[PDB]
């Protein structure tokens, strides 16, 4: 029901047709850069790469081929946890500022 | 020994502007807009130069001068309507500027967005002012209905139009300070471009993906740098299309009737490039609200970074998004289309949703959308 | 279940009984079995002048060297012999001599410290080895950053008053004292109603009062040919000394304002105020999450190596400020800084931080108030600063009264609008001149 | 932000030919009009919608004015 | 006891506030009084010849 | 906005208020003045001996 909508907007956006998973498309403000540096190194060579290759594709305007797509059950949410844990600390740092 | 253009400092400003400036391998044609912004002001510049060799502000010979300009001075008529028509190509570039602005999340460097939006009230001063220049009969009478708008103002109101009037109407002071003024502003424009450049280049330049492209750079001389000049290229084209083979394809014709300060002109309407705002002030029947709307419908890009709240920077991954936004460029076709057109009952109800539609896309829609988004996307 | 007002009741009270002399004998009892016995003189460098600066350090040099009673050696034998740790300790403003031992000692102890404080021989072979030392003595203490800095602060902000002199004194008075200079100089200064014995741990007061009565009594305040030294009251000048040596590794400056006196009850805001600003090492573990701005951004950025608060107060004025190292392109942005924390607990602080400030306020009061030693040098300089010792109950009303408009109120009074005395040391160069150093004192927006 | 100290990249190999050892329109109609229908079909469904709205409200716009130009016989009637 | 100036610190120079609204009712004050006497000086100066001394004889 | 919803955020609005009133105070001098005003200048005194 709902993860039939969730599907369609993962196949509607074009980041899995890159190549890309969801947490490399997330903007980079703050927390996100250190949710990045906190990365274990395989993680982020892993993403680094990624990212390197989807922007190869649209500097071409190309998409990878249908078979190496990534599956929107396969799609893993590396950078949740860490940057979870980035927002928590910075609104315990916010919360002890504001009283 | 050391490299003159690294070590030499003109030199290394130019070379870390222009030559060896890190760029994003894949930002696409939509990117060459802001070199084609440049060049359409210094072409510009350089043509508003020379029209001003042959230009005399007085009332009574400045429909004389730009008759002069047209028929006597050699190539005058090229110039002349190089500058009318590169007044028009400005403005599409910088309506398509900022298009791409909105749809990629440019709007994040928060600065170089900022110093845009100053950047287009002053480019839109400036070609309200030169309209004014050549003094027919169109150009005294959108500029006594445009100024005639600050009235609304409450308290100062009257004394400040009549201190941009010069008087009590539009008049010869009028026509000189607008001579004057369109003469300086563009060098201003020259001046806040640089202050972009800066700001921009703190932060880099913004990919189609959105997403940070340190790892994928190119140098802009060995690339980027042919691509503006294709683009440069091609924007000459459009533009030397409409200098000749239509001269007069995008002006009113009733700018080459002098100006009769007793007899008001069939239809007034701005230029085609005011008349999404001329259509959103007329859609408020009251004075200062229309006044207020014309502000707000230009200041609302002030306002655009705040309402951001997807996760995503560009709309390149975002569907919903893109559909609101192509409806708002559709929006702003609609009130251009009902702006040229009368005050009638057809067109003024048009008029009025597409002001409430313009307003709420930008306001209300597009952030529930990015929301709905988000939510979709297991956020 | 004791709580911290009903700890502060229990404390033992300090008994403060004077000899006809004019001594004052001041005693805290505890269990503990051992006792530190001192003598606590009102002479310093800031009752010396020019010719005569630094013969209080020689005294103070030459002091466990030998009395007429016991020779050079015989002194040492004995303290060593009771396992006693005799230690002295010279200032602008206080010099002392204090003997750490077990109770049962107590009365060789006082013995050794009269023979000490009255029959000291000075005698002229001895003057010449410290005279040696002492000269090498300064030597060494031109290495020790520090104390160079702190000296400059004082000779540039007491400028043309006594308090500029350093303890120690120029190396050309070391040279040109004499045993008469000496002599002249413990008779001026070394006088019964200016000195104070006191003692902590395992003392009773009958029996240190009994033995100061055997022994301190023939010490009198009496002054000969009546030639009383007094007082003089010392101008805070604002000035700046730079002294530019660029090889030094890394930059020490030191920059202070006008304090309160010792009495004066603006002392406990301001302790409150400084502890806000608090202190920072780049060993301190806590780092960038620290409380102390000025101490996050310092972690952050690596602007300094170390920086501290410090509430120096002589009798009439005192030294309220901060010193910090940095490295030679950090001083304007620590001094930028340092000042914006100024500014903001002049003008904007708030209720949290003073909480912070006055419980750290509280626990370095207690803390330092810990063992014999310092409970008796505590003892006799708060007899001889305040006339009284202040109690722990008395210290934790003043600071509870302190809020946050207390210390706004002193900040601005202290600290707003008002000349500082900067002294620096190393590569200073990009430490501000000091018009920019005045205009960071206050701020356009308030 | 020189280029030499932009990010922090490991273990990634490109492999680049020279301008003049390559075409410069490698199957620029071949490969290039299949991409291009791919880009088309994606794009349409999303950018043309809204403006087909538009020429609905204009054509109806331009009717409807100019049927209000138009005589209403009933009114000179009678 | 404070002199004046020490009273005019402490009352109005201390923080940049109080000093700016000083500073801004003086402009207004010393425009009005310095326009009066600069006039009057100019006036008198030039007495006799200034249309404003010499319109009584011609109006009316 | 929520962070700034806090009591010490009060403290610091409170701390600052009479400054930002009398930064209105001299804004409001500043702009009777430049402008003579004359609606509030004939209130006052002795500069309504002008106009
Ligand atoms: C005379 C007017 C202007 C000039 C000369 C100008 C010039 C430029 C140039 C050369 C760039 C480099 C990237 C590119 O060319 O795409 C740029 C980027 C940018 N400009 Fe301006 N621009 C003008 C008006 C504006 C306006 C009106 C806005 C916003 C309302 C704006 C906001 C931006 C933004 C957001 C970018 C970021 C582009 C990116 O992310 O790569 N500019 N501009
Ligand atoms: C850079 C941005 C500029 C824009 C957008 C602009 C726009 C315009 C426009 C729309 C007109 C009216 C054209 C017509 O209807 O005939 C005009 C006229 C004129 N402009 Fe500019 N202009 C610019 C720069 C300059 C500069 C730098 C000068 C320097 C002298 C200048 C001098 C003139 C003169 C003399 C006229 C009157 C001659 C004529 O109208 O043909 N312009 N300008």
């Given amino acids: ?99 | 020994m050391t490299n003159i253009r690294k070590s030499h400092p003109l030199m290394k400003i130019i070379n870390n502007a222009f030559i060896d400036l890190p760029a994003p391998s894949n930002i696409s044609s939509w990117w060459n807009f802001g070199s084609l912004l440049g060049i359409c002001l210094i072409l510009q510049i350089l043509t508003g130069l020379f029209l001003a060799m042959h230009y005399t502000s007085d009332t009574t010979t400045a429909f004389s001068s730009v008759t002069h300009i047209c028929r006597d001075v050699n190539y005058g008529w090229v110039i002349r309507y190089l500058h009318a028509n590169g007044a028009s190509m400005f403005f599409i570039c910088l309506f398509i500027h900022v298009g791409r602005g909105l749809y990629y999340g440019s709007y994040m460097f928060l600065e170089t967005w900022n110093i845009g939006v100053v950047l287009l009230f002053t480019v839109m001063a400036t070609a309200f002012m030169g309209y004014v220049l050549p003094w027919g009969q169109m150009s005294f009478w959108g500029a006594t209905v445009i100024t005639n708008l600050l009235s609304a103002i409450p308290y100062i109101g009257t004394d400040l139009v009549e201190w941009i009037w010069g008087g009590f109407s539009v008049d010869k002071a009028t026509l000189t300070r607008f001579f004057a003024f369109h003469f300086i502003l563009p060098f201003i424009i020259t001046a806040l471009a640089a202050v972009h450049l800066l700001f921009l280049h703190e932060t880099g330049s913004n990919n189609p993906t959105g997403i940070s492209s340190d790892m994928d750079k190119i140098p802009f001389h060995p690339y980027y740098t042919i691509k503006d000049i294709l683009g440069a290229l091609f924007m000459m084209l459009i533009l030397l299309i409409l200098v000749l083979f239509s001269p007069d394809l995008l002006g009113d014709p009733d700018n080459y009737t002098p100006a009769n300060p007793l007899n008001t002109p069939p239809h007034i309407k701005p230029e085609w490039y005011f008349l999404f705002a001329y259509a959103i002030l007329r859609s408020i029947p009251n004075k200062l609200g229309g006044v207020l709307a014309l502000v707000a419908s230009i200041l609302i890009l002030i306002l655009m970074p705040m309402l951001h709240t997807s996760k995503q920077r560009s709309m390149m991954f975002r569907p919903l998004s893109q559909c609101l936004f192509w409806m708002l460029v559709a929006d702003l076709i609609t009130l251009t289309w009902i702006g040229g057109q009368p005050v009638e009952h057809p067109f003024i109800i048009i008029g009025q949703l597409a002001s409430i539609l313009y307003f709420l896309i930008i306001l209300v829609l597009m952030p529930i959308t990015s929301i709905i988004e988000n939510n979709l996307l297991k956020w | 279940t004791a709580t911290y007002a009903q700890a502060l009741q229990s404390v033992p009270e300090t008994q403060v009984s004077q000899l006809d002399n004019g001594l004052r004998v001041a005693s805290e009892q505890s269990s503990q079995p051992t006792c530190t016995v001192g003598v606590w003189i009102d002479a310093g460098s800031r009752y010396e002048n020019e010719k005569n600066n630094g013969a209080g350090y020689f005294v103070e040099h030459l002091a466990f060297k030998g009395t007429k009673n016991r020779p050079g050696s015989a002194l040492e034998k004995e303290v060593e012999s009771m396992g006693a740790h005799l230690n002295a300790y010279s200032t602008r403003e206080h010099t002392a001599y204090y003997i750490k031992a077990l109770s049962k000692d107590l009365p060789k102890a006082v013995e050794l410290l009269a023979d000490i404080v009255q029959n000291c021989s000075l005698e002229d072979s001895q003057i010449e080895k410290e005279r040696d030392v002492i000269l090498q003595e300064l030597q060494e203490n031109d290495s020790s950053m520090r104390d160079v800095v702190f000296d400059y602060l004082h000779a540039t902000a007491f400028q043309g008053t006594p308090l500029a002199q350093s303890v120690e004194g120029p190396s050309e008075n070391v040279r040109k004292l004499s045993r008469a200079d000496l002599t002249e100089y413990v008779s001026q200064h070394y006088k019964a109603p200016r000195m104070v014995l006191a003692a902590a741990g395992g003392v009773e007061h009958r029996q240190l009062l009994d033995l100061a009565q055997k022994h301190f009594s023939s010490l009198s305040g009496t002054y000969v040919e009546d030639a009383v030294p007094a007082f003089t009251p010392c101008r805070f000048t604002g000035s700046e000394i730079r002294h530019r040596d660029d090889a030094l590794p890394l930059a020490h400056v030191a920059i202070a304002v006008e304090g309160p006196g010792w009495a004066n009850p603006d002392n406990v805001p301001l302790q409150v105020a400084n502890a806000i600003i608090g202190h920072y090492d780049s060993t301190y573990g806590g780092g960038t999450h620290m409380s102390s701005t000025l101490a996050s951004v310092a972690a952050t950025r690596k602007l300094c190596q170390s920086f501290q608060t410090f509430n120096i107060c002589y009798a009439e004025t005192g030294l309220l400020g901060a010193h910090f190292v940095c490295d030679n392109m950090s001083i304007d942005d620590m001094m930028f800084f340092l000042q914006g924390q100024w500014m903001r607990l002049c003008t904007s602080a708030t209720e949290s931080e003073v909480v912070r400030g006055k419980n750290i306020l509280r626990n370095a009061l207690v803390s330092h108030l810990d063992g014999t030693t310092p409970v008796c040098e505590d003892i006799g300089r708060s007899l001889l600063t305040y006339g009284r010792r202040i109690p722990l109950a008395e210290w934790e009303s003043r600071i509870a009264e302190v809020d946050a408009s207390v210390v706004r109120e002193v900040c601005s009074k202290y600290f707003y609008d008002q000349c500082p005395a900067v002294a620096g040391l190393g590569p200073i160069e990009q430490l501000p001149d000091y018009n920019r150093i005045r205009s960071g004192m206050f701020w356009l927006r308030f | 932000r020189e280029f030499g100290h932009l990010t922090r990249m490991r273990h990634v190999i490109t492999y680049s030919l020279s301008p003049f050892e390559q075409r410069a329109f490698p199957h620029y109609f071949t490969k290039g009009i299949p991409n291009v229908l791919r880009r088309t079909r994606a794009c349409i469904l999303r950018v043309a919608p809204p403006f087909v709205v538009f020429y609905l409200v204009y054509t109806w716009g331009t009717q409807e004015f100019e049927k209000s130009k138009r005589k209403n016989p009933a009114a000179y009637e009678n | 006891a404070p002199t004046l100036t020490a009273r005019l610190y402490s009352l109005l120079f201390r923080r940049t506030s109080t000093f700016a609204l000083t500073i801004a009712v003086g402009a207004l004050f010393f425009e009005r009084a310095f326009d009066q006497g600069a006039d009057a000086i100019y006036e008198h100066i030039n007495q006799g010849k200034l249309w404003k001394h010499i319109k009584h004889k011609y109006e009316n | 906005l929520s962070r700034f919803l806090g009591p010490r955020y009060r403290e610091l609005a409170r701390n600052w208020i009479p400054t930002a009133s009398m930064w209105g105070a001299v804004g409001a001098v500043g702009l009777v003045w430049a402008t003579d005003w004359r609606l509030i200048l004939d209130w006052v005194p002795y500069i309504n001996g002008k106009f």
């Fill in chain 1, 1 to 99: 029901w709902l993860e039939g909508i969730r599907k369609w907007y993962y196949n509607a956006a074009g980041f899995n047709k890159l190549g890309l998973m969801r947490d490399d498309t997330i903007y980079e403000d703050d927390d996100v850069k250190e949710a990045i540096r906190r990365l274990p190194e395989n993680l982020y060579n892993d993403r680094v790469f990624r990212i390197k290759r989807a922007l190869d594709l649209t500097m071409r305007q190309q998409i990878l081929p249908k078979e190496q797509w990534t599956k929107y059950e396969e799609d893993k949410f590396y950078l949740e946890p860490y940057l979870k844990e980035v927002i928590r600390e910075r609104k315990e740092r916010e919360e002890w500022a504001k009283k």
